Amino acid sequence: SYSPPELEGNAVVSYSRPTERNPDGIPRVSQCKFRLPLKLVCLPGQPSKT
Amino acid sequence: ALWEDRDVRFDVSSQQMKTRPGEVLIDCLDSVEDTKGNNGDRGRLLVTNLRIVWHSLALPRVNLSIGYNCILNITTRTANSKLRGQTEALYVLTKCNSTRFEFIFTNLVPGSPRLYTSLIAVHRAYETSKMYRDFKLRSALIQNKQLRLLPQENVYNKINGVWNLSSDQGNLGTFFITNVRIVWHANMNDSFNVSIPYLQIRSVKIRALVIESSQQSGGYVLGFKIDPVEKLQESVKEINSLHKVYSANPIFGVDYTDAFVAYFADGNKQQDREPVFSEELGLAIEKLKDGFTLQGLWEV
């Protein structure tokens, strides 16, 4: 029922680089954030005076 | 003549590490560090056809050569957990001319430990095949009436009525000639058979079929006598031909300094005092060392 604090969302990938020192791979993390539109949480409605 | 599979040598030359004619390399692994000698130096491990070799890979002079007829136990130790990958280690226990050594081989890079498996395999192949390169008396060679052949062995000449000039009354027996070894059973209580390998033969001459052993089975002179000597010289010449054509490229039937002092399995001990009786325990016990007593060695 309540509207979210912000429409932005995050997406995070955690992967591994296989290296000679650690054949199992050093873990790295990288992220990107998208911006959602008002058309997902709002609608055009009637306005009030006060 | 052949020492690669009979001794354990340290600081071996760059030539004796090279594959002998009958030998053949199987598997190799770099960066195998040597331990039980705390030099902390890397190397390279080789599991050949007759022996295992390790050379320092940076100072290739210092090295180790361990024969397969001089190893007793080979143990792989998988440890050194999550902190890094599961690395293995090889523990080899060796006993050459009554002296016990132990070598440890640590795979530094945990990305290739497969070697330690194949070694075990080939070692079995080394022990399951000793009728190819060793001399044996009175073994279980004969089937109902014929010879039980090794894997890579077929008979050449099948001669009946070949005597043995080492006994008195149990002589007349068949003589089997093969490409790996020559055998003679007794045709009467056929458990007096001798199976001489071409590897142990030193020279086949006549004085009568005299066969000498190559200083490993002792000076075992074997004398046989046959029917009129035509077939006799025929057999001698064909035996010499087979001996030479084998010695050209040996078979081995394997299917598929102070360096010593830092590798003792006991610890500052290369010895075994004369085993004498023990009135205390009732067992044959090693002689005690100049003042020591059993009930004083036992307690703490």
DSSP chain B: ---TTT-EEES--TTTTSPPSS----EEEESEEEESSTT----EEEE-SSEEEEE-SSSTTSEEEEEGGGEEEEEE--B--TTS--B-EEEEEEESSS-EEEEEEEE-STT--THHHHHHHHHHHHHS--TTTS-EES-S-B-SSSB---TT--EEEEEEEEEETTSSSS--EEEEEESSEEEE--SSSTT--EEEETTTEEEEE----EEEE-SSS-S--B-EE-SSHHHHHHHHHHHHHHHHHHHHS--TT-----SGGG-BSSSS------EEE-TTTSSEEEPP-TT--HHHHS--
**Residue B50 sits in the same domain as residue B150:** no
- In the DSSP assignment, the letter for residue A15 is E
Q: Is B263 among the domain residues? A: no
**Residue B129 sits in the same domain as residue B141:** no
**Residue B121 sits in the same domain as residue B151:** no
**Residue B149 sits in the same domain as residue B212:** yes
How many independent structural domains does chain B possess?
2
Binary contact (B85, A20; C-beta < 8 A):
no
Binary contact (A24, B85; C-beta < 8 A):
yes
**Residue B154 sits in the same domain as residue B244:** yes
Q: Which of B30, B31, B82, B84 to mutate to test the interface with A (most CBs of A within 10 A)?
A: B84
Question: CB burial class (10 A; 0-12, 13-18, 19+) of residue A17?
Answer: exposed
The nearest alpha carbon in chain A to B111 belongs to A23
Interface check for B110 against chain A (CB to CB < 8 A): the answer is yes
**Residue B151 sits in the same domain as residue B70:** no
**Residue B177 sits in the same domain as residue B242:** yes
**Residue B166 sits in the same domain as residue B239:** yes
Interface check for A16 against chain B (CB to CB < 8 A): the answer is no
Q: Is B295 among the domain residues? A: no
Indicate the residue among B104, B133, B162 that finishes a domain.
Answer: B133
| Structure tokens, B22 | 């009958």
**Residue B172 sits in the same domain as residue B114:** no
Q: Is B79 among the domain residues? A: yes
For residue B31, the enclosing domain spans: 1-133
Q: Is B277 among the domain residues? A: no
**Residue B93 sits in the same domain as residue B148:** no
Binary contact (A20, B109; C-beta < 8 A):
yes
Interface check for B111 against chain A (CB to CB < 8 A): the answer is yes
Rounded to whole angstroms, the Cα distance separating B157 from B131 reads 19
Distance from CA of B111 to the nearest CA of A (A): 7
Chain A CB contacts of B110 below 8 Å: 23
Q: Is B50 among the domain residues? A: yes
Distance from CA of A23 to the nearest CA of B (A): 7
Q: Is B172 among the domain residues? A: yes
Rounded to whole angstroms, the Cα distance separating B168 from B148 reads 27
Resolution in A: 4.0
**Residue B158 sits in the same domain as residue B84:** no
Q: Is B3 among the domain residues? A: yes
Solved by what technique? Answer: cryo-EM
Interface check for B218 against chain A (CB to CB < 8 A): the answer is no
